[PDB]
Amino acid sequence: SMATYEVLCEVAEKLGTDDREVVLFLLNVFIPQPTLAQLIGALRALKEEGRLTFPLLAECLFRAGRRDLLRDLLHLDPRFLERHLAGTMSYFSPYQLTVLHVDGELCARDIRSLIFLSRSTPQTFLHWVYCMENLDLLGPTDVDALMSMLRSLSRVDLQRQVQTL
């Protein structure tokens, strides 16, 4: 299965300011605070270098939290895809899935404190994680740079799920 170029444009229009950052992270190619041109520009490069398969995008929208779109553009049943991607193995790494979950369990007070504690990561948790990818501090092998930043913030309860995944 493969992601159609025409469908890819319809997904980029219906993606909000905050959703953009999440999708790009799950697809590996990430650009912080992206415009419509920047979002389609990365998507076109994945569907041109064969990487953008149909179930990679179907799962990408199911994991991002946009279950409305599966039945809108992809014409899939999100209830069947939910029951399907449970027994089926996930396209994404448990490191990509952990970062996305840690993102959701963060508060506005913590996200501002994140910046003042640590280019200089403009108002994004995924933007800070992207810095560590280039600065060799966060990776699927090493997540202790995040564990220290979690303990030294307030969310000490998130270190248990992180230590697992």
Residue numbers in the entry: 0 to 117, 124 to 170
What's the publication's text?
An R12E vFLIP mutant was generated to maximally disrupt the vFLIP–IKKγ interactions and a D102R E104R vFLIP double mutant to disrupt vFLIP–vFLIP contacts. All were observed to have a similar elution profile during SEC MALS to that of WT vFLIP with the exception of R12E. Rather than eluting predominantly as a monomer (preceded by a small dimer peak), the R12E mutant had an enhanced dimeric component comparable to that of the monomer in terms of UV absorbance (left). The tendency of this mutant to dimerize was confirmed by native mass spectrometry and shown to be reducing agent dependent since treatment with 10 mM TCEP resulted in a shift to a predominant monomer when re-investigated using SEC (right). These observations could be explained by the crystal structure of the R12E mutant that was refined to 4.2 Å. In this structure, six R12E monomers form the asymmetric unit, two of which appear to be appropriately positioned for formation of a disulfide bridge mediated by C106, in an extended but weakly stabilized interface that also incorporates E12 and K13. Furthermore, ITC experiments confirmed that the R12E mutant had a similar Kd to that of WT vFLIP consistent with previous reports and the high levels of similarity between the R12E vFLIP and WT vFLIP co-ordinates in the vFLIP–IKKγ(150–272) complex when superposed. Whilst all mutants appeared unimpaired in their capacity to associate with IKKγ following immunoprecipitation consistent with our biochemical and biophysical assays and were expressed at similar levels, R12E displayed significant reductions in its capacity to phosphorylate GST-IκBα(1–54) and NF-κB activation. The fact that the R12E mutant appears capable of forming higher order species based on our SEC data, the lack of a clearly defined hetero-octamer coupled with the defective oligomerization observed in blue native gels suggests that the vFLIP–IKKγ assemblies capable of activating the IKK kinase are structurally specific.
Pivotal to the survival of both tumors is the canonical NF-κB pathway that becomes constitutively activated by the virally encoded protein vFLIP.
